[PDB]
Amino acid sequence: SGFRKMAFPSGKVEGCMVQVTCGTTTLNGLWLDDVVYCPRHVICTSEDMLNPNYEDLLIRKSNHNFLVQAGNVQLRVIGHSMQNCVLKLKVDTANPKTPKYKFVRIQPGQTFSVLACYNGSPSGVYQCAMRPNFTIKGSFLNGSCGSVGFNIDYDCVSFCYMHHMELPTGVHAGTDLEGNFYGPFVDRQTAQAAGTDTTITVNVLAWLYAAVINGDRWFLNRFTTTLNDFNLVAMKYNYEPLTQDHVDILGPLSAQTGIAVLDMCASLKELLQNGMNGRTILGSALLEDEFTPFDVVRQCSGVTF
Amino acid sequence: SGFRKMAFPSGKVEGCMVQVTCGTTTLNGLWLDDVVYCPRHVICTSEDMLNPNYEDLLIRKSNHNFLVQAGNVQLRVIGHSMQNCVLKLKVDTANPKTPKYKFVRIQPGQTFSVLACYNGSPSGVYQCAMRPNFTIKGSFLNGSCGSVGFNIDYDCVSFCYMHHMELPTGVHAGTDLEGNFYGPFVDRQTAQAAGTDTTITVNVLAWLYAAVINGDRWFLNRFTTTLNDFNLVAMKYNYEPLTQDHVDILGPLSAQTGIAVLDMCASLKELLQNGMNGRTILGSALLEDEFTPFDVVRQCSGVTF
Ligand SMILES: *[C@@H](CC(=O)OCC)[C@H](C[C@@H]1CCNC1=O)NC(=O)[C@H](Cc1ccc(F)cc1)NC(=O)[C@H](N)Cc1ccc(F)cc1
Ligand SMILES: CCOC(=O)CC[C@H](C[C@@H]1CCNC1=O)NC(=O)[C@H](Cc1ccc(F)cc1)NC(=O)[C@H](N)Cc1ccc(F)cc1
């Protein structure tokens, strides 16, 4: 029993992390087979910030202008190209530690592990959710760009996020590994704002199931509601509408606990309207929305990789 | 910016995990050089567990009663002994992935990462604190025994915990890698319970510093206090007493924020006596006590490994 913010084991990703330096600028890159992937803003200077002419900047660069190091050991760059907001540096050595991998684009509300890195060296690993406004609430400092997010699906590492920037509100934005931003963001320093964020309802419900599995059941009554009536309340509290597809995804947890999904919804409706009356759930005094239904199953059933 | 429950990168430990089977019983072991470490109750049957005579059970067993597997690779056992509550199995091949390592006994209040494993295969990584009552609030299922806790210092892995059991209250108890239990617990299935727990004051203070670094400042008040006065309030609220060495360990965070430690104590005093009043700190409505001062520095300064 117990329930923690648990990330995927990071070893497979640690062996891919390198440092990329262009001029005065160093960030992290992902080294897979004979290609290193990193944010293309490594080739910028401050004159470039509002209107970087990336094609011009790259044309002026030769392979020797990129210093790639793997554990402080130089790798020779032999080719360079750009895909969307990611730079692809072909190196003359293939990474012998490349895991089976795929590049995926995740959906809002889904989670992933982030391996936070500085100068090609990992600092720590933590779990993030893609927020409905396409930011993440990460933990990133100067030097962290090029850090990646990933899930492990079987023995395949599915990379889904590469870190580019922090908004003034303290939240984070980045791309998939093909260089396409999540959300309405660009890698030009215009003033950019995220939409208002909402709470990920399906994840809150999954976390309430996690609490029940762990014996933390005080908020359960033999109440039930309809999907429409639940949604009428949810939207008053800035929660995403719950769809029948979401109800379906909660099946496995409903099956384990014997608590119908619309009964759990009636419990959540009561918590929103009446509060928690000083009580905690799974050690939290707030309703948590960064565990997916799969996260709860994975953790409450012991899946390995 | 940002602040997350961050674990250490787990790669160095992943390469050390193996599966140990004795008859029908399988759990995890730690393979370092040519020794595999695991909990000694692997040699039991649930009939033994009232009063297991481990010395009898171990002397009767031969090396071939022990099946050790690194992935699919069988490691031949050439010796078996006991050290306190940990079995040591000498194998004929040294782990080629053995990192630089030490065995440490951690103190109450200190944190570590846990790599939760099943059948020798890593499932996830998360951060834990050693509670003042020598339990941890982990996340462990059947099959997880022999999972380890660790910290990393440079390139040295400091193993500090090996998992053995769950108390009926849902908390977890285990040993260091010399096989000595944390707290008063024993590896026999007798009624056992942990002392009442308390809150880790120095960690709460470190987390309040993390909040200021991150721009949460509302709870700062103009007052100061003394250690003696503050410790009177600490005991009222079941907080550990603060020592001068704790104050000194907070120095790096006081240095970065310019908030003196005894002014932060005054702020915490008022939080304890008036609550948060529907405000949050770092996205929590409770005072969090599972980040050490070094955890906050590591995370808010970008220390890597
Ligand atoms: C790990 C054992 C394992 O993996 O072997 C494979 C068969 C397992 C970890 C717990 C399972 C659920 N959550 C856990 O953290 N440990 C046990 O199952 C442990 C076995 C044991 C029995 C007696 C003893 F003295 C030490 C270990 N049994 C328990 O955790 C349960 N709860 C019984 C128990 C044991 C000791 C106590 F003080 C109180 C309850
Ligand atoms: C120099 C070495 O290379 C890095 O390692 C840098 C990574 C670091 C991670 C940050 C650092 C603090 N914590 C984070 O997470 N990234 C940055 O500094 C970005 C760089 C960058 C400018 C322009 C743009 F288009 C894309 C990206 N600059 C901002 O983030 C600033 N906030 C300015 C800003 C504000 C809103 C917005 F939409 C875009 C840029």
**HEC profile of chain A:** CCCCCCECCCHHHHCCEEEEEECCEEEEEEEECCEEEEEHHHHCCHHHCCCCCHHHHHHCCCHHHCEEEECCEEECEEEEEEECCEEEEEECCCCCCCCCEEECCCCCCCEEEEEEEECCEEEEEEEEECCCCCCECCCCCCCCCCCEEEEEECCEEEEEEEEEEECCCCCEEEECCCCCECCCCCCCCCCCCCCCCCECHHHHHHHHHHHHHCCCCCCCCCCCCCHHHHHHHHHHHCECCCCHHHHHHCHHHHHHHCCCHHHHHHHHHHHHHHCCCCCCECCECCCCCCCCHHHHHHHHHCCCC
Query: CA A69 to CA B8: how far, in whole Å?
Result: 22
CA atoms of B182 and B177, how far apart (whole Å): 11
B277, two tokens: 């009043």
- Work out the number of other CB atoms within 10 angstroms of the CB of residue A110: 18
Residue that the structure tokens 């992943």 belong to: B14
Among residues B265, B189, B285, the alpha carbon closest in space to that of B220 is found at B265
Write out the H or E segment, with its range, that includes residue B70: strand B66-70
What are the CA-CA distances from residue A81 to residues A55, A78, A87, A220 (Å)? 10, 11, 6, 56
Q: Give the span between the Cα atoms of A146 and A19, in whole angstroms.
A: 9
Handedness of CA A251, A257, A258, A259 (dihedral sign): negative
- In angstroms, the CA B109 to CA B129 distance is 6
CA distances from B302 to A113, A124, A128, A196, B22 (A): 17, 9, 18, 29, 43
Contact A209, A253 (CB under 8 A): yes
- Intra-chain end-to-end CA distance of chain A, in Å: 20
Residue B69 CA to ligand 1 center (angstroms) comes to: 22
Burial class of residue B36 in the structure, from the number of CB atoms within 10 Å of its CB (0-12 exposed, 13-18 middle, 19+ buried): buried
The one-letter amino acid at A47: E
- In this structure, how many other beta carbons lie within 10 angstroms of the beta carbon of residue B59? 10
- The neighbour count for residue A54, using CB atoms within 10 Å, is 17
Q: Record the tokens describing residue A70, joined without a space.
A: 């793997």
Find out whether A82 and A23 touch, Cβ atoms under 8 Å: no
Name the minimum distance, in Å, from the CA of B267 to any CA of chain A.
Answer: 21
Return the SS3 of B146: coil
Which CA distances in Å does A169 have to A86, A192, A288, B65, B92? 24, 10, 20, 60, 56
Torsion of CA A173, A177, A183, A188, to 10 degrees: 60
Q: Is B145 marked active-site?
A: yes
Could you tell me which of B161, B158, B157 has the C-alpha nearest to residue B147?
Answer: B161
Identify whether the C-beta of residue A155 lies closer than 8 Å to the C-beta of residue A220: no
Residue B197: partners with Cβ closer than 8 Å, 6 or more residues away: B131, B132, B133, B135
Determine how β-strand A156-166 pairs with β-strand A101-103: parallel
Whole-number Å distance between alpha carbons of B20 and B15: 15
Nearest CB partner across the interface for B4, out of A117, A139, A286: A139
Pick the closest to residue B255 from B290, B212, B191 (CA basis).
B212
Amino acid at A100: K
Which of the listed residues B166, B187, B192 should we mutate to test ligand 1's pocket, taking the one with most ligand atoms within 8 A of CB? B166
Which amino acid does the sequence have at B87? L
Tokens of B141: 């299922």
Q: Could you say which residues from 137 to 166 on chain A have a Cβ atom under 8 Å away from some Cβ of chain B? A: 137-144, 166
Q: Determine the residue of chain A that is closest to B136 in CA distance.
A: A2
Give CA–CA dist A228/A240, Å, rounded: 13
For residues A16 and A122, the answer to whether their CB atoms sit within 8 Å is: no
In angstroms, what is the C-alpha Rg of chain B? 22
Residues B61 and A167: their CA atoms lie apart, in Å, by 62
Residues with CB under 6 A from ligand 2: A 25-27, 41, 49, 140-145, 164-168, 172, 185, 187-189, 192; B 1
Partners of A157 in beta bridges? A101, A152
What is the per-residue burial (b if ≥16 Cβ within 10 Å, else e) of A217-229? eebbeeebbebee
Residue of B nearest to A5 (CA): B126
Residue B39 tokens, joined = 């909990």
Eight-class DSSP state of B121 = E
CA B258, CA B108: separation in Å to the nearest integer?
28
Inter-chain touch A121–B304, beta carbons under 8 Å: yes
* Per-position b or e across B208-223, b if 16+ CB within 10 A of its CB: bbbbbbbebeebbeee
Residue B158 burial (CB count, 10 A): 18
CB–CB of B98/B32 below 8 Å? yes
Q: Are the C-beta atoms of residues A241 and A284 closer than 8 Å to each other?
A: no
- Please check whether residue B237 is in contact with residue B197, taking contact to mean a CB–CB distance below 8 angstroms: no
Q: Which of A6, A115, A285 sits opposite B9 (nearest CB)?
A: A115
Instruction: Quote the DSSP letter at residue B119.
Output: T
Task: Using DSSP bridges, classify how beta strands B121-129 and B156-166 pair: parallel, antiparallel or unpaired.
Answer: unpaired
Query: What does DSSP assign to residue B9?
Result: P
Which has the closest alpha carbon to A79: A42, A40, A119, A34? A34
User: E-assigned strands of B100-221?
Assistant: 100-103, 111-118, 121-129, 148-153, 156-166, 172-175
- Which of B22, B41, B44, B164 is catalytic? The answer is B41
First vs last C-alpha separation in chain B: 20
DSSP code, position B144: -
Joined tokens for residue B164? 């053995």
Residue B277 makes CB contacts below 8 A (sequence gap 6+) with none
The data reach a resolution, in angstroms, of 1.7
